[PDB]
Design a protein around this nucleic acid. Structure first.
Lengths: 275, 356, 138
RNA sequence: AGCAGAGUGGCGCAGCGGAAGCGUGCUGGGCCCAUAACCCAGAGGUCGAUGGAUCGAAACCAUCCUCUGCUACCA
């Protein structure tokens, strides 16, 4: 089953929706509201762009998806009406971001419902409401807050224990909930030279290396790799960046401070930056 | 078998640009002198070259290009001997062979060999003309005595006779051990030849010039030897001749891109003077050698070790000048100097002398 | 010196009936029989002949040919190659003389054994007669 | 040993978690008495080698190779 992306059925007024086109006529252009259950709609020929038009083939072509702003919605007929002139490209960028994110949520939900052999299609509406639309409610928005929910879900299972699923549904849920969202391997890196010296400058730089290899953090290993005798990349493999960059700069600071007793000067190379 | 020992000789390779000097030096030693990417692409020598082979011999690869000439001259002051390779390309190779010969005459390196390279590529007529040109050019200069042996260094024909001839005619000179110990740093691994005394790994040593600190002045730098090397090989002892590798205590980032280059090295205990002003008794050349009266406040170039440095003449006389340098040079004792002046954006050798 | 005159007569490479080759630049003069439409086409023919016969492998003449005047165009077969714009016969011929002049033949040895190589960063060229470093960049 | 782009469905940039997508150029029409302008239609089918599901892999994501543009400093 293919249904509404969100809990709501018909789109709300003055939103921006990604839509695909079906036909082209004289009095307008028919269209397929992909973001809400593939429901048909029409865009008027006048309601295209506020410029002296020359080629309607150039604007809307049969078979490409574009951004539209919903204009006049009604229910008693269901006459969905869109346009393109009141669309500035910043909203278009946010529209494609939101629709892509919803396609990721729909793809993984299609994956789990298909691998469950959950052919039952109102039960797929039930599965959407039981997990997806309530998580849209839990951050009170579709899309970005849903991304926040699954951003916890692939990492911490605690919010996933706030579901209603059975024994096997969690199995296929984890089987497709993890291996599609975390390729991260975000390793904080900073190549660096410490250009300290003195009369005993051999032991000044070796004391800096002593600090550099004993101020190593445990879960976040501050490793050292030498290519040139004053060159080394500071490397930490930790997944969370806010701890990694902070303890990288703190370790570098204590290294430079204990070798600021002897004349310590710093050859700056790079900054704390994740991948 | 042959003994593994420090190199006893440094042999220079000179001649006109693109004549094939570098290929010949590579042919003799077996090592590639070209360090820089620019030098490889340009097909010219930017920096002073070094290569080693047992005989233990070394080749000093000089630049043919007219602009690069001053660094080669500085290295030549350090050099124990040289070989002049004369290509098939031209009877008059390109002015600089004569200029280096004149510098050698001032320096007193009389023992010279003339090598006729690329005989296969050129005509017999060119060879006869070259013979007459060689006779006229060599006459009246230090080169006059030098023998000429034809060979093709690249092809490797008649090399054995060349090694015996070069060994016989151009011997390695001894050393002057009595003077205060000196090791010469050309690059910054650092390469050079040990002139006197001895150094050991782990021993405290000093770079006599040291460093101009950010009036600003320079205090000599005493430091230690992390390791001891001959070219890219480690040895227990070092003698004159060849490029030996001297390790130092300085951070290599500081030394990087030849920052230390041109300094001299001695033991930490040794007492070298680091002087802004020096007195030199000198004489001047008749003509302007660099092409194909001295006054005060001018900048002249003095070559000591790998370094060349300017200073200003407060007063000028027939044979003496005093100069205050931008960065200090270390003068541990009196020695030999070649004097050059920069004219028309190129450094040209005006004269030579000794520092009293 | 006459010991060494005898040496230059006797330290040569082994005496084969080939002789001195002063300005032996190879005139195998085969300019393209360019058919031009008169507006915006040239057709390089004899291109696989040069492009395989001369020791310069395919796609390596292409960028240098498109370099001169900045004219576009690409493959349409090596023989019968379409290049943007109109050219005269002697000029593109002379560009091929230039191509031989500085890129596949250097005056150290004008011999057709200048086989292609590439070093660590830049295109280098040698010569099996002599094996020199003809690193071309300009 | 550091940083990006690439393993062409017709030239050039690669259009991004569903195959040329577009800008351009070429070939051809239409409009005009003509020309420019503008408009329109077209191109022999593992698009590096390897893993994992997938409705999905030239255009997912990780890996190994090469290439380019950019390194650094000593042999």
């Amino acid at each position: 089953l293919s249904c509404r992306f969100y809990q709501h059925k018909f789109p709300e007024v003055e939103d921006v929706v990604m839509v695909n086109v079906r036909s082209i006529a004289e009095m307008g252009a028919y269209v397929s509201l992909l973001e809400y259950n593939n429901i048909e709609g029409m865009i008027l020929l006048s309601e295209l762009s506020r410029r002296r038009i020359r080629s309607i083939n150039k604007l809307i072509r049969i078979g490409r998806n574009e951004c539209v702003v919903v204009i006049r919605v009604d229910k008693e007929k269901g006459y969905i009406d869109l346009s393109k002139r009141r669309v500035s490209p910043e909203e278009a960028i946010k529209c494609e971001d939101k629709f892509t994110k919803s396609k990721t949520v729909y793809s993984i939900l299609r994956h789990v419902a298909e691998v469950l052999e959950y052919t039952k299609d109102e039960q797929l509406e039930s599965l959407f409401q039981r997990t997806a639309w309530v998580f849209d409610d839990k951050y009170k928005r579709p899309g970005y807050g849903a991304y926040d929910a699954f951003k916890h879900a692939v990492s911490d299972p605690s919010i996933l224990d706030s579901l209603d699923l059975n024994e096997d549904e969690r199995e296929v849920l984890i089987n497709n909930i993890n291996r599609r969202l975390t390729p991260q391997a975000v390793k904080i890196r900073a190549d660096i030279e410490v250009a300290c010296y003195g009369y005993e400058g051999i032991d000044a730089v070796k004391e800096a290396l002593r600090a550099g290899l004993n101020c190593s953090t445990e879960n976040m290993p501050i490793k050292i790799n030498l290519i040139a005798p004053p060159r080394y990349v500071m490397t930490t493999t930790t997944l969370e960046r806010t701890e990694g960059l902070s303890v990288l700069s703190q370790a570098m600071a204590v290294i430079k401070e204990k070798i600021e007793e002897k004349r310590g000067v710093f050859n700056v190379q790079m900054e704390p930056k994740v991948v | 078998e042959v003994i593994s020992r420090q190199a006893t000789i440094n042999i220079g390779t000179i001649g006109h640009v693109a004549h094939g000097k570098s290929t010949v030096v590579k042919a003799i030693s077996g090592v590639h002198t070209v360090r820089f990417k620019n030098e490889l692409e340009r097909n010219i020598t930017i920096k002073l070259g070094y290569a080693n082979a047992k005989i233990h011999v070394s080749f000093v690869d000089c630049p043919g290009h007219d602009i690069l000439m001053a660094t080669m001259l500085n290295g030549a002051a350090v050099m124990d001997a040289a070989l002049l390779l004369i290509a098939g390309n031209e009877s008059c190779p390109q002015p600089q062979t004569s200029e280096h010969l004149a510098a050698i005459e001032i320096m007193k390196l009389k023992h010279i060999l003339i090598l006729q390279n690329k005989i296969d590529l050129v005509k017999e007529s060119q060879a006869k003309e070259q013979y007459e040109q060689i006779l006229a050019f060599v006459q009246g200069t230090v080169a006059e005595g030098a023998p000429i042996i034809p060979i093709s260094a690249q092809l490797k024909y008649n090399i054995e006779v060349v090694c015996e001839y070069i060994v016989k005619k151009i011997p390695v000179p001894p050393r002057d051990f009595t003077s205060e110990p000196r090791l010469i740093v050309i690059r910054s691994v650092a390469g050079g030849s040990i002139l006197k005394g001895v150094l050991k790994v782990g021993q405290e040593i000093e770079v006599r010039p040291g460093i101009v600190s950010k009036k600003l002045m320079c205090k000599p730098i005493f430091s230690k030897i992390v390791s001891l090397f001959a070219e890219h090989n480690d040895l227990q002892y070092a003698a004159p001749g060849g490029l030996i590798g001297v390790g130092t205590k300085i951070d290599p980032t500081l030394c990087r891109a030849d920052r230390m280059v041109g300094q001299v090295l001695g033991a930490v205990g040794a007492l070298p003077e680091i002087f802004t002003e020096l007195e030199i008794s000198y004489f001047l050349l008749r003509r302007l050698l660099g092409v194909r009266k001295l006054s005060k406040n001018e900048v002249l170039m003095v070559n000591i070790g790998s370094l060349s440095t300017g200073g200003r003449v407060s007063a000028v006389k027939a044979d003496l000048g005093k100069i205050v340098l931008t960065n200090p040079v270390c003068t541990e004792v009196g020695e030999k100097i070649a004097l050059s002046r920069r004219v028309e954006k190129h450094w040209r050798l005006i004269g030579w002398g000794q520092i009293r | 010196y006459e010991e060494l005159l005898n040496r230059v007569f006797n330290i040569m490479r082994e005496k084969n009936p080939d002789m001195v080759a002063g300005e032996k630049r190879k005139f195998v003069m085969k300019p393209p029989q360019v058919v031009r439409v008169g507006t915006k086409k040239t057709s390089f023919v004899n291109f696989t002949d040069i492009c395989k016969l001369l020791h310069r492998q395919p796609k390596h003449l292409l960028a240098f040919l498109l370099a001169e005047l900045g004219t576009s165009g690409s493959i349409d077969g090596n023989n019968q190659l379409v290049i943007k714009g109109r050219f005269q016969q002697k000029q593109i011929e002379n560009v091929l003389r230039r191509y031989i002049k500085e890129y596949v033949t250097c005056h150290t040895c004008r011999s057709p054994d200048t086989i292609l190589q590439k070093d660590t960063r830049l295109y280098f060229l040698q010569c099996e007669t002599c094996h020199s470093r003809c690193s071309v960049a300009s």
